């Protein structure tokens, strides 16, 4: 697994690769991946630094990991709006409690049904200020999701099932990062209608955050993880042995 | 001071009046008023009940009061959006920590520069859900502010100084409750441009919350407190001996 880390770092231009042994199910896998990320943050997140935090189960596992961490006054800033899916805001609050710092809420919903409503929220001074804080963070903590993980935008009524299938088929979206931006298998940003329905950071923000820590546990989602690595924004990849093997195979071939 | 409580209850149709002795300055007064409210909530807020929470220094003092309270699983729900002024969201988080429950964020800013932007946020499913939770709360914890306490809407650029003076002079606004609604000295809701710039609950919501706890410490703000009492929405008034004397004098005369 340490040999795997070196190959991943070399192959994908990472700062680090944190690889957990394969577990019996996805819950257990997320916990073990989250353990390595928790320790990484414990050692690296200094007082006065900030983390831009995305949403969902991979990220939530880091907040829920019950390991020992030193207390420091760090900030946890939502990188995506709230939901009425584990909310980035809730995760930041749990992280602040765990690591001994503070959290900073993005006062806007995660999803809207129209890019004009998106624009209206995004131009608002209160929303812009928090997004600027997240853009200026030293770290980002994000999950890599597959299209099926985003299906809640549809089930919540913000995007049609027809539009959703078309994002995949017409626009070639194979995954999301942090919940807030979407990519193709080749790592390019696809103009997709999807992102017009989300309030949060974008891919270019992640490209300029020094330490983007991205997390995925499921090897069946290796295409999404590959797409995400191809965007070039990831600095620390935390994942399982099988995912690592899959990525190296896909890259070699 | 106990005699004062009985007269206030009778005169203003309250459930309770919590009266603190006069203090040397407003900070100390807010602390002592907040002590009585903290104890009231300790005894009355049951597991599974909720509090709709407004913004500002009077309310924040209750969260910051360092008394002993029993832990119970109550909810603290923001009744007004966030600010980039002590935010209702921050207060709810501190209350949840203190009383041992949870908090529920309103994912929208407190202020907007245009009632059309207000309407767009207010119609959004995520915002409507939280506002419905706050409307259905057993308690509300709100401060009674004077126009000068709201001047931040102006300083933050959401409302012009000219509009602000006109809200007072043309529309007769003498105070706010919770940060989110405004009233005249006679207790009627004034159609004012001000409320078109705020996202949160309104006076009619407070009228149907069973236990509206309203807090003010400054006797120089007695006109605002009088206006607020005249709206009829207040169930528990927490304030100082001098404010109580002022209110009884104003009512008698």
DSSP track, A111-143: B-SSHHHHHHHHTSHHHHHHHHHHHT-SEEEEE
Tell how many helices (H) and how many strands (E) occur in chain B.
11, 9
- A117 CB near a chain B CB, below 8 Å? yes
Residue B136, CB half-sphere, CA atoms under 13 Å: how many? Answer: 9
Alpha helices per DSSP H over A67-114: 88-99
**Euclidean distance between CA atoms A84 and A110, whole angstroms:** 9
Per-residue DSSP letters for B56-67?
Answer: SHHHHHHHH---
Which structure tokens are listed for B76?
A: 């603290």
CA distance A124 to chain B (A): 8
Chain B residues touching residue A156 (CB < 8 angstroms): 125
Angle at which helices B222-230 and B241-252 cross, to 10°: 60
Q: Give the 3-state secondary structure percentages of chain B, helix then strand then coil, rounded to 5.
A: 45, 20, 35
A187: left (phi over 0), alpha (psi -120 to 50) or beta: left
**Which residue in the set B83, B105, B106 is minimally distant from A126, CB to CB?**
B83
Nearest to B107 among A108, A117, A125 (CB): A108
Helices A57-64/A26-44 angle, 10° precision: 60
DSSP string, B181-203: EEEETTSPBP--GGGGGB-B--H
**Contact assignment for A89 to B105 by CB distance below 8 Å:** yes
**Is A125 part of the contact surface with chain B (CB cutoff 8 Å)?**
yes
Residue A203 Cα distances to A126, A181, B111, B129, B166, angstroms: 21, 6, 29, 30, 45
How many CA within 13 A on the CB side of residue A85? 26
Residue A139 bridge partners (DSSP): A51, A211
Cα A74 from Cα A95, distance rounded (Å): 10
Distance CA B56, CA B90 (A): 10
Rounded CA gap, B197 and A2, in Å?
57
CATH number at residue B171: 3.40.50.1360
For residue B121, give both structure tokens.
């946020």
H or E element in which residue B126 lies: helix B125-135
Based on C-alpha coordinates, what's the Rg of chain A? Answer: 17
Please state, in angstroms and rounded to a whole number, the distance separating the CA atoms of residues A246 and B17: 68
What is the nearest CA distance from B199 to chain A, expressed in angstroms?
Answer: 11
Question: What is the rounded distance in angstroms from the CA atom of residue B195 to the CA atom of residue B203?
Answer: 11
For B128, the closest chain A residue by CA position comes to A84
Rounded alpha-carbon distances, angstroms, from residue A59 to A39, A178, A213, B93, B126:
14, 8, 10, 21, 22
Q: How far is A175 from chain B (nearest CA, A)?
A: 24
B25 φ, ψ to 5°? -155, 175
Interface residue A206 vs chain B (CB under 8 A)? no
Run of H or E including B242:
helix B241-252
Read off φ and ψ for residue A218, nearest 5 degrees.
-100, 115
Interface residue A111 vs chain B (CB under 8 A): yes
Distance separating the N- and C-terminal Cα atoms of chain A = 21
Range of the domain at A250: 1-253
Q: Where are the beta strands (DSSP E) in chain B?
A: 16-20, 50-53, 75-78, 102-104, 139-146, 173-177, 181-184, 211-215, 236-240
Q: Report chain B residues whose CB lies below 8 A from the CB of A130.
A: 84
B125 touches A: beta carbon within 8 Å:
yes
Q: How was this structure determined?
A: X-ray
Residue of chain A whose alpha carbon sits nearest to that of B157: A125
Q: What is the resolution of this structure in A?
A: 1.7
Dihedral class, residue B178 (left if φ above 0, else alpha if ψ from -120 to 50, else beta): left
CA separation for the pair B70, B250 (Å, rounded): 38
Output b/e per residue, B200-215; b: 16+ Cβ within 10 A.
bbbbebbeebebbbbb
Say if CB B35 and CB B20 are below 8 A apart.
yes
> If you search the block for the tokens 């009619």, which residue do you land on?
B204
Would the CB atoms of B105 and A112 count as touching at under 8 Å? no
SS3 call for A222: helix
> What are the structure tokens assigned to A237, written together?
């990849």
Q: A197 CB near a chain B CB, below 8 Å? A: no
B117: nearest CB among A112, A120, A130: A120
Q: Cα-flanking dihedrals φ and ψ of residue B130, to 5°? A: -70, -40
B7 burial via Cβ count (<10 Å: 0-12, 13-18, 19+)? middle
Helix spans in chain A (H): 2-12, 26-44, 57-64, 88-99, 115-122, 125-135, 152-155, 161-169, 203-207, 222-230, 241-252
Distance in angstroms (rounded) separating the CA atoms of residues B15 and B216: 17
**Nearest to residue B218, comparing CAs of B197, B193, B244?**
B244
- Hey, which residues 46-85 in chain B have their CB within 8 Å of chain A? 81-84
Contact B199, B109 (CB under 8 A): yes
Structural domains counted in chain B: 1
For residue B89, list chain A residues with Cβ-Cβ distance below 8 A. Answer: 105, 107
């Amino acid at each position: 697994s340490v040999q795997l880390e070196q190959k991943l770092v070399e192959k994908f231009n990472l700062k680090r690769a944190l690889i957990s042994l394969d577990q019996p199910n996805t819950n257990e896998q997320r916990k073990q991946v989250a353990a390595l990320v928790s320790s990484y943050l414990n050692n690296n997140l200094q007082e006065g630094m900030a983390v831009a935090v995305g949403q969902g189960q991979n990220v939530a596992a880091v907040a829920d990991h019950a390991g020992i961490v030193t207390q420091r006054n760090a900030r946890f800033v939502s990188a995506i709006g709230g939901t009425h899916i584990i909310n980035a805001d809730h995760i930041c609050r749990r992280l602040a409690k765990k690591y001994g710092g503070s959290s900073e809420t993005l006062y806007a919903p995660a999803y809207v049904n129209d890019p004009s409503l998106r624009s209206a929220f995004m131009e608002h001074a209160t929303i812009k200020e928090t997004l600027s804080q997240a853009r200026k963070a030293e770290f980002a903590l994000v999950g890599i999701g597959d299209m099926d993980e985003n299906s809640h935008m549809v089930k919540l009524g913000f995007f049609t099932p027809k539009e959703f299938v078309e994002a995949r088929l017409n626009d070639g979206i194979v995954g999301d990062i942090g919940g807030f931006d979407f990519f193709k298998l080749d790592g390019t940003d696809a103009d997709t209608l999807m992102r017009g329905r989300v309030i949060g950071l974008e891919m270019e923000d992640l490209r300029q955050i020094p330490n983007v820590v991205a997390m995925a546990s499921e090897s069946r989602k290796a295409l999404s993880i590959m797409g995400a690595l191809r965007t070039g924004v990831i600095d620390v990849l935390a994942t399982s042995v099988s995912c690592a093997m899959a990525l190296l195979n896909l890259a070699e071939n």
